[PDB]
Design a protein around this ligand. Structure first.
Ligand SMILES: COc1ccc([C@H]2Oc3c(OC)cc(CCCO)cc3[C@@H]2CO)cc1OC
Ligand SMILES: COc1ccc([C@H]2Oc3c(OC)cc(CCCO)cc3[C@@H]2CO)cc1OC
Ligand SMILES: [Mg+2]
Ligand SMILES: [Mg+2]
Ligand SMILES: [Zn+2]
Ligand SMILES: [Zn+2]
Lengths: 324, 324
């Protein structure tokens, strides 16, 4: 089984990695083994003098603080977003554009971006007067929490994977990670996409043909949108993966709706298992959210993402065909 | 004692209330007795069906969570900002601008806006890796905490002063209080001032000169700048009040700078007792922060802020004359 897992991890650079099979073959440690593989691939342990035992200890502790009993927002989703961000970071249009610290920040942000997610939305936490919403004043409630847990865990025994960064490096990384994870709040999607559209319409490329990003605001915006694209990448994956992600988000949505109904609250969009259309909801999700975002990303890195966009469009056609 | 306490309270509608005497005469409960008086003056207990005993129970609990060993950011400051906001809300140029719930939100926000303040700045909390900065991801660290404490205390026994507001009133009040207290973060001063300046250049008024604010984004901005003005009202008060506030903030600054020196951190501006000029600092504070703000405010409510502005310029003249 060890050799089987290593064979599967040879695909870590490919869109459509069989992340559910890696979860099984790793003994439910997909986030740990995919993060470890990616860190080795990018030589991040040597670059940042990260002891391997500290990396594994932190990763296993982080993975533990994802909920194994939530259908979607669990360690498999975290591993998927990490691996998807890793592929997007390798896109030719971005070659040599980001520093090693920015690459570290984007991968680390992906790894922590949903940690300790309870399987219900920000609006549900606000409307039920949850402790989380009281702590965070109704503002990016989950995403502030994911950050606080992700950084707090660095303080557990032999968990500080950043122990050999300089003070300046730690300060820069912390700021970038916060900026990235807060941008995964779905209520910021329209603003993030509008800014990405503006960058595409004003795009500049260097002599080497890669994207020209010469200030913090443009650089962090690309990293924010990259991780957001990875977070919203399920419909761009091979259909057998996409359908499993749909099965899982619908389970989480329906269980939230059952709690809303039981509390006499209005049921959230797509959360009423008695009056839901899974297929129509996926087509609308693609048409109004995912394809607008990915089409814009694909324009930013053209032609690098053409195959990802082609898969998304095929999957949209397939879900549509199950309606008629 | 209670009879002279009552005579001092007769000036709750005047700039330059003797708040320090009121703190002494009330047994160190200036926030409780000033809030109570203002709620009666504005008829808020009748308007919102707030039981008196619940108002007092909450106010004393809130007052208890201000620290008695911090020289400035204690319950006397909170009482002063409450009273200052109460007077600003009575500006003639604002006579019909704000609803009763908006008035309620600005006053409640003032009362809680520094609760549980540790006597050190956000930057200190960030650069020392404090628990607060870890919880709040280095963003408006103090102000998020003041809000979380202020609202959490409403859940103590007989502390829910909003129990009789409709569910929608409570939702709207919560949103406005959060928007106001978050804007008291000093790092946002220039942005707030810029928006106030834009409001002034786009100002619309009646034939009488009363402000017309149609959209929530403009109204909440005025309320944000109003509580900010009250927070920064010490140099516009009679000199013998202002001088007491200066003594207190400088004790707080010097204790923080001693902690920064000892930790080997850069010492924050105005915090090094060995190299400080209290008087030059006050004049710079007025020239670069307090007067640009209050002069912009004065223009928004022209000419009802002229006496406040005059006093500020007089106090600036006095502090400048103490520099040889
Ligand atoms: C496989 O399908 C999915 C995978 C992931 C998603 C996620 O994206 C969004 C989202 O983005 C614009 C908005 C909301 C608000 C919903 C209000 O009820 C929810 C989600 C999901 C949870 O984070 C949704 C999916 O299908 C709808
Ligand atoms: C009586 O004197 C004072 C009374 C109150 C004050 C307060 O105002 C400011 C402030 O205003 C824009 C900026 C900072 C630095 C952080 C900016 O990110 C600190 C303070 C004081 C504490 O909140 C200062 C005083 O003197 C200097
Ligand atoms: Mg999330
Ligand atoms: Mg404050
Ligand atoms: Zn996610
Ligand atoms: Zn204050």
């Amino acid at each position: 089984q060890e050799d089987v897992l290593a064979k599967e991890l040879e695909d870590v650079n490919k869109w459509g990695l069989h992340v559910f099979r890696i979860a099984e073959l790793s003994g439910n440690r997909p986030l740990t083994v995919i993060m470890h593989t990616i860190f080795q691939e990018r030589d991040l342990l040597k670059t940042f003098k990260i002891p391997v035992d500290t990396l594994i200890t932190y990763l296993m502790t982080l993975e533990d603080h994802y909920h194994a009993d939530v259908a979607y927002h669990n360690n498999i989703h975290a591993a998927d977003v990490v691996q998807s961000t890793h592929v997007l970071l390798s896109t030719p249009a971005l070659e040599a554009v980001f520093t090693d610290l920015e690459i570290l920040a984007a991968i680390f942000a992906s790894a922590i971006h949903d940690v300790d997610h309870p399987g219900v939305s920000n609006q549900f936490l606000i409307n039920t007067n949850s402790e989380l919403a009281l702590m965070y004043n109704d503002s990016s409630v989950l995403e502030n929490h994911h950050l606080a847990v992700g950084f707090k865990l660095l303080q557990e025994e032999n968990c500080d994977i950043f122990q050999n960064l300089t003070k300046k490096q730690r300060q820069s990384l912390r700021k970038m990670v916060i900026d990235i994870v807060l941008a995964t709040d779905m209520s910021k999607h329209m603003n993030l996409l509008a800014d990405l559209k503006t960058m595409v319409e004003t795009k500049k490329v260097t002599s080497s043909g890669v994207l020209l990003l010469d200030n913090y605001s443009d650089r962090i915006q690309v990293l924010q949108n990259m991780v957001h694209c990875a977070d919203l990448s399920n419909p761009t994956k091979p259909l057998q993966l996409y359908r499993q992600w749909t099965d899982r988000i619908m389970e989480e949505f329906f269980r939230q709706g059952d709690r809303e109904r039981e509390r006499g609250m209005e049921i959230s969009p797509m959360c009423d298992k008695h009056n839901a259309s899974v297929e129509k909801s996926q087509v609308g999700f693609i048409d109004y959210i995912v394809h607008p975002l990915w089409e814009t990303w694909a324009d930013l890195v053209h032609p690098d993402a053409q195959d990802i966009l082609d898969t998304l469009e095929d999957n949209r056609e397939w879900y549509q065909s199950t309606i008629p």
